[PDB]
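Appendix B. Extra example for self-study. Work through it before the problem class; the solution is given directly after the inputs so you can check yourself.
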Amino acid sequence: MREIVHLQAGQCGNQIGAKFWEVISDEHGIDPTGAYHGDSDLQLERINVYYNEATGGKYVPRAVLVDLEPGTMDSVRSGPFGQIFRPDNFVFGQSGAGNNWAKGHYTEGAELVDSVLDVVRKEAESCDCLQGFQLTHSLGGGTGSGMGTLLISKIREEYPDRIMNTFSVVPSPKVSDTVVEPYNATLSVHQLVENTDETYCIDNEALYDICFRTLKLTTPTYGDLNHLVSATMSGVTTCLRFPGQLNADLRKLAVNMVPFPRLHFFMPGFAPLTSRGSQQYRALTVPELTQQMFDAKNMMAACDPRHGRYLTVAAIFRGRMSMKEVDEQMLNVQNKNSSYFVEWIPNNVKTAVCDIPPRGLKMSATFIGNSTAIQELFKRISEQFTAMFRRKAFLHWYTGEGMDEMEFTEAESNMNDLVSEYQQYQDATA
Amino acid sequence: MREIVHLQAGQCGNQIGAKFWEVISDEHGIDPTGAYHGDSDLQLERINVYYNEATGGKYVPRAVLVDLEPGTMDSVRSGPFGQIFRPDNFVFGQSGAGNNWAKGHYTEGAELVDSVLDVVRKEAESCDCLQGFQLTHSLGGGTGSGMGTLLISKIREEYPDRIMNTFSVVPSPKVSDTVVEPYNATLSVHQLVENTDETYCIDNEALYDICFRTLKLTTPTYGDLNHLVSATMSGVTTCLRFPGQLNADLRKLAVNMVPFPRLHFFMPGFAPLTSRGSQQYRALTVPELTQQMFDAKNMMAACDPRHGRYLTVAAIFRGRMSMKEVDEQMLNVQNKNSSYFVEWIPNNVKTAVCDIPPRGLKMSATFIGNSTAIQELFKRISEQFTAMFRRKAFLHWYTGEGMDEMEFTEAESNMNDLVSEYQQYQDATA
Amino acid sequence: MRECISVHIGQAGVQMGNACWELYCLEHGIQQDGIIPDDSSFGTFFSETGSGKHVPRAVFVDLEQTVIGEIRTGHYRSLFHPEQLITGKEDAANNYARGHYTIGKEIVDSVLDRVRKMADQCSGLQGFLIFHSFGGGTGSGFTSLLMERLSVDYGKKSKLEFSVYPAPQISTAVVEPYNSILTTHTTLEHSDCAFMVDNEAIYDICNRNLDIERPTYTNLNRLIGQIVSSITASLRFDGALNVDLTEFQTNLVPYPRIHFPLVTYSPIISAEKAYHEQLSVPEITNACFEYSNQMVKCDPRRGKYMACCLLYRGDVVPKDVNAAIATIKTRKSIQFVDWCPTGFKVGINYQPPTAVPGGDLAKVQRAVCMLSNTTAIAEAWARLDHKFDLMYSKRAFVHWYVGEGMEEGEFSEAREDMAALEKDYEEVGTES
Amino acid sequence: MRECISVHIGQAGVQMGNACWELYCLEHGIQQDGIIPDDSSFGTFFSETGSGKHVPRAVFVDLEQTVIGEIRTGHYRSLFHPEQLITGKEDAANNYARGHYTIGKEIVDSVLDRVRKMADQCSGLQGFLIFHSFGGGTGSGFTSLLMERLSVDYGKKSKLEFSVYPAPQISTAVVEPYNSILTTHTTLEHSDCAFMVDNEAIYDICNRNLDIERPTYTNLNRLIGQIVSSITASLRFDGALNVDLTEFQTNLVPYPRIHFPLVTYSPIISAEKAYHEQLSVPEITNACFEYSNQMVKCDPRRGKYMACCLLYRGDVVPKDVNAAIATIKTRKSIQFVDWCPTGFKVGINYQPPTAVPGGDLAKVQRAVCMLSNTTAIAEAWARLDHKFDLMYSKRAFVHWYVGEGMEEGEFSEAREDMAALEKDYEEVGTES
Ligand SMILES: Nc1nc2c(ncn2[C@@H]2O[C@H](COP(=O)(O)OP(=O)(O)OP(=O)(O)O)[C@@H](O)[C@H]2O)c(=O)[nH]1
Ligand SMILES: Nc1nc2c(ncn2[C@@H]2O[C@H](COP(=O)(O)OP(=O)(O)OP(=O)(O)O)[C@@H](O)[C@H]2O)c(=O)[nH]1
Ligand SMILES: Nc1nc2c(ncn2[C@@H]2O[C@H](COP(=O)(O)OP(=O)(O)O)[C@@H](O)[C@H]2O)c(=O)[nH]1
Ligand SMILES: Nc1nc2c(ncn2[C@@H]2O[C@H](COP(=O)(O)OP(=O)(O)O)[C@@H](O)[C@H]2O)c(=O)[nH]1
Ligand SMILES: [Mg+2]
Ligand SMILES: [Mg+2]
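Solution. Structure tokens for the complete assembly:
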């Protein structure tokens, strides 16, 4: 029960999703061929959350991989753990989006979105108790921002009550990798703010720092970052798959992390993260794991929480731990950094403890934080969006695909309101 | 409990500190790799004072090594007992200070001081009961005088109640090794007199004499002197780590050794110190150990106490001793040299006896003396400072880094007042 | 799954194309024929046949038959399908009218047919690659004639072109201003992105960086071939961050009438002097923005960048790319336009560049090709327009063009259109 | 982690630099190429490449191409990166104006570019080392031209220079006073510390202490190389009391306009006569302050010391250094200025000096290099100024300088500036 159906999009989604399924299979003892060879029996009890069963023990991930070009998917199946997926789930077009939201949303992805739903509905209908949909994409691209938001809107109109959680890679502030990011990001956020229950913002610049500072890695491939993103994705869905002292369902986090409907953007974090040489200089106990989770340098988003306040926070622990220490340490943070937590929420921390830790680790903890500091990210995008749009920087690539200039104004205005709403709630009572 | 956090600075601090940790590890049975292989169990009971624990028995010193150049630290880790430290504690810059206090205090160390605190606070926050901070540096250099005083000011503004004890290498009178010592020393003392509870003045000229006269050593390396400085540093913190008949906490010494707030400069001493060939011509009993402690030739400071009076004195004994002899011998000194002790303090001697002696020794004793004779040191620096400053000897290297000529005048005036204060209290009642 | 139709017009295109397909054949293990010895990503460029023969997806067209005849007798004689190599009767004699109106009217239909047969043989059409000279003749009339036909038959499909833009001082034809401007007027509305290269610039690179005092056109073509291999590398090979030919359009073209990026290829280093260079990512990235390494003799710092695409190859760590670009953003001399806060498009590929045997370039580990759109190129048009005005005031060579199907009015229209384009750059280059 | 950019200008710098990098290569096990045989502290001076080739972090620049061409054909042909060795068309012909205004204006930009590429390849910039002649030509015009450019592009970074100061009696050029004064005027405000050496002084040492009656410039260069090795030894090797290149500035420069220390290297002893010397620390230390061993023919006892730096190497006990300096402080003949009670800066290193094969110096155990700032050098400027005044009164050679970009006014300004500097020394040398 509580089955989750995995949806991909764009080059970013398939790459992250591919590493997501490699990790999930590893902790469930699933071979790349699809067979089960695990040791513990608990990992097989709740395997229906992510996998479907077939004859001979083969387990088929409940994943839908989609993009407007076949190249990335061809890489996925060829690579390790690529044969695991069911072939029918690869819904791909021929002409890719040129990194323009209009093409992937109105023109190119429009003629392919119908096929994707035919696979989603067949997947969704096969669940005993559907919990929700998990989506991974990037807001700066064309397929992700355009088609990903198109898929979200269709699903939210077809499964209104289910939970839609999206792990979106957000453009970094320092340097970009697509010239038209402000157009794609602003248009995508105009859709997410209405049709997803929780979004986890991550930017590559933040994950580079985590590897450079913490992991002390000198050749960080995109695979390395995807592993970190996979770990946070894995952590938030541990209660559904393993026993624990205090469980936290996906809908349980949203209630504790989303005060108001439009403020559903979080910045995740993970711990512990130590270099191979620094493993022997740590106690690896509960007090220190909680210490770095709230550290600004151990968060997978560019925004620094010191610039704002935490509306809410969630800490999902893994491994056998003293519940007293978890309660004590969490309270300690609430006390010292009382200036960092909003004052009209008496308690901002939600604690969950899964019993089984990730492979090779005795302890783990995943941080989720809803902070007014995230308004910094949106304002930066708004500043770049208005600079380009003030003199029609690249519109003809978008207006020529079917969009209209009014849509850009609506997206900017809606983006501005969200920034204002975050700022309004950063002021204390009265 | 009563944990001490060790802070380094400059080339001098790292060299002395490196030898400090080699000795401390030796008496606690800690291998250079970090494992414990001691014989007695007492040395492991209070190991938390200087070491933190990790998995597999590895013990991590609570030390912070910092300097504005990587060269000295690279030597420290490469050398013996260099792998013991946690890598994160090495906070180093790229452009070193040119032996000018201004650069290490205002310009170069300013952009690095913040990182050091991030390591200190993480270290300090991990103590069950923080006693204080122990700092080793040199007043004649740039990083030590500038950055060391910068670190002291930040800590004293962040931990006002904790005790800050500094082991500072003071410029020698005979010959110098830095042309601008008077500027660096005067500026540093202007800071220490306000932001440290006790400073232990040592000069290399004094330690050369101790080796030449007492130890009869013909090739004294800087390592040899560092061992003597390590021994006095080790002795003053034996009560915290071992049992004894009469214990003396670090705060216990300051109360008994610091009559007035600004007169917190001591000149230490150690005993016994015998050459390899003269070991067989000594009884090595309490009466003789006390005899040489008050001898002017067995003190690690240039100033001779015969030129002044002892405000207070502390004698920290180690090893199993007859408490009667300690009391009798200490009283005997008070009687013969009654002209050498101030008269408005009825009792000037503080006695402490630790039960366990240093490795290879049956007995030991560490002398600490607050004497008005130390005004000789400051007046000598003041004489050299005014000679140079009278005609702008080297100011442009300091004023160009951000300082102002008014700061030099304030430092000289504050230095002059301290000399006056020592002289005022050298006159008997009325 | 992907595809590209390479159309090579005029002597410049055919000779440049020969270097390209020599390099493509090397990169895929092909053996100078359609055969592969006893290698799987060739589908983008090379068609396959049951005999094991791979047929290039290219069309070699020239109103002159001298250069194409050399191919039919060269080492690549058995590589191309014979009907692809289309040869006219007589050349255009460096006359735009002959290529566009009189001669081109008898060959444009034939080449279009072969494109049609190739177009419907593709699983999915991605775009075209057009190689032609800007000097004039077939490269100006026929190319403009062919481009307008494609704009109708294939409409919104991408049409990329690489052009040998006239050099500032060096010149080989007396009537380049007439032909260079005329082709621009008839190709602005039919081309998506035009990549510019000048022989003088590559001559400077070949002697300033490669230690060769005798550059031939073969040397320049191989340098141009490497650029094209990098642009199409994303399709041909796997990588961490792929970029497609449809992306260059929205990434480098801010306005429909301003689609003329410059070209740069950083690790142009001799074999001997490569031993004394670390060739790390940051240094090669910084080399792109120097005036000394532009493939078009137009100094970028005279104007403002407005869009840049970086295409990395080989053993490249994306973290260094992030660091390397950010520092370039910091420099105050490297000025970007106000209205483009997001300046860079980044693509990374795992295939290191292949060195052609007998070549001059070193066996580099990692390489970067930069496609930068800058207002500095507005100066090049101004210089070209200045030369055109001098001749036209005297009607220096008009009678040749007027008497071969063209009209006196078109000269005025073409120059006036260029004047607006020069003015268009000024508006883009000014903020508030 | 540390770095130093060595810039060698003119024939004196290039020939002196050759001795330096021959010595550096020996001290690190390098094999006359970038290769190291089948050695870890070279990072300060030598860059590294994956091939195992170490590229010197130096720039050899000369408006003449004769000397640099010899390097390209010498045993160190494969050591330097070719673009580092920059050669002009024609020499400055011993004319300051040609080096500074006419010729230098066509090469200064090229050398600055290579420095820029080296500057941003360093983990952290520590300073520069400039080797040049004071006689004139490139060593005066180009160096002054280059120094002022560095003062802007790199600002507060250290800029140390070693100069071949003109000898009192021996002279090789007729117009040295013009060039020697002109470079001083334009380098006082752009240089941090200038180390002086005279050929006559080293000639005296080479024949008075080394038992060689035929000193060549190779002999002098090797003696100068040892001095530089000691100055940069602290960075290259471990020691008890290290000294950095930024420390010399505040330790030896009491005022901005007085930064001309002398140079001394004590254990200059022949191999045969070393067997009859104990070579203990106290004796070598006392040898530094003798007039007979100064590398600049200026007697210190004619004036007052104001700052001294002692750099010990090899098996040296710091206790002896403390004792040795104190006794020197006692002597009444060794007079230090009143306002500098703290006279000495001491640095100790564990690496004994390496004797170049075929060299003249003995296989010493411990060595000391002294950098002393003294008012005695004011006499040298006075002698140089006296020579300048004689020629200028007659306008002996002015037309050469005036006709090649310079002006008659600069001669007066330069001499007047020197007059103030001579007066500045007098004020420093008097107390109360
Ligand atoms: N890079 C490069 N440029 C070339 C090459 N061949 C010719 N060009 C350029 O082309 C210009 C000369 O015009 P052509 O390309 O020969 O004109 P065409 O294609 O022969 O057309 P017609 O004049 O009608 O024969 C010169 O300015 C050259 O820059 C080549 O092999 N490589
Ligand atoms: N120590 C040392 N000094 C040299 C050497 N070569 C030349 N000099 C000095 O340089 C002076 C002569 O001027 P040059 O250095 O040759 O001038 P340049 O660098 O050739 O510049 P131009 O005159 O323009 O060619 C003489 O006074 C010498 O003292 C050398 O190899 N070693
Ligand atoms: N973590 C991660 N991020 C990626 C990867 N590939 C692309 N991205 C991000 O995705 C953005 C590019 O958008 P993309 O998904 O390629 O556009 P689209 O696929 O055409 O819709 C870039 O800003 C990258 O930061 C990957 O493999 N891993
Ligand atoms: N005991 C001891 N003293 C030292 C050592 N190294 C330097 N010193 C002293 O430190 C002073 C030099 O200051 P230094 O610390 O090097 O300046 P900085 O590091 O740049 O701030 C000298 O006067 C020496 O007496 C050492 O290894 N041991
Ligand atoms: Mg032709
Ligand atoms: Mg010359």
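Self-check: The two ends of chain C are 46 Å apart (CA to CA). If your reasoning did not lead you there, revisit section 3.
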